[PDB]
């Protein structure tokens, strides 16, 4: 069992060109930017992001 | 590579169907699904590239 895992929703993360699935994270100053995702598995309807 | 991909994918033929564009020459290429084989694991699983 992986401790302190983080799950993302299904259609919240989408892939652009050259693969490289990304998700639109929101900054503390209400700005927005897309970050890369190291998604390796899906549990139910939630992607398991390892880092990013 | 992704810039050359975007140029040859999204803007290339709309550029080439315009008037007077007789030829083009693009630096780079499009995406292609490259499959890099490893010869050690090919030797491991008794497989050939064919």
Q: Report the length, in residues, of chain A.
A: 52
Where do runs of H (alpha helix) occur along A1-52? none
* Resolution of the coordinates, Å: 3.2
- Residue A49 burial by Cβ neighbours in a 10 Å radius (0-12, 13-18, 19+): buried
A-B C-beta contacts closer than 8 Å = 8
Indicate which technique resolved this structure: cryo-EM
Cβ(A27)–Cβ(B41) below 8 Å? no
Which of A18, A19, A20 should one mutate to test binding to chain B, selecting the residue with the greatest count of B CBs within 10 A? A18
Which of A15, A16, A17 should one mutate to test binding to chain B, selecting the residue with the greatest count of B CBs within 10 A? A17
The span from the CA of B3 to the CA of B10, in Å, is 10
For residue A15, which phi and psi values (nearest 5 degrees)? -100, 140
Question: What separation, in Å, do the N-terminal and C-terminal C-alpha atoms of chain A show?
Answer: 20
């Amino acid at each position: 069992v992986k401790q302190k895992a983080i799950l993302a929703p299904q259609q919240g993360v989408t892939r652009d060109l050259k693969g490289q699935a990304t998700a639109l994270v929101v900054n503390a100053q209400n700005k927005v930017e897309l970050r890369v995702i190291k998604a390796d598995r899906v549990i139910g309807d939630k992607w398991l992001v390892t880092e990013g | 590579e992704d810039l050359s991909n975007y140029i040859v994918s999204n803007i290339q033929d709309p550029l080439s169907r315009t008037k007077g564009v007789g030829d083009f020459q693009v630096f780079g290429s499009q995406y292609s699904m490259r499959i890099w084989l490893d010869p050690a694991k090919l030797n491991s699983y008794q497989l050939t590239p064919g």
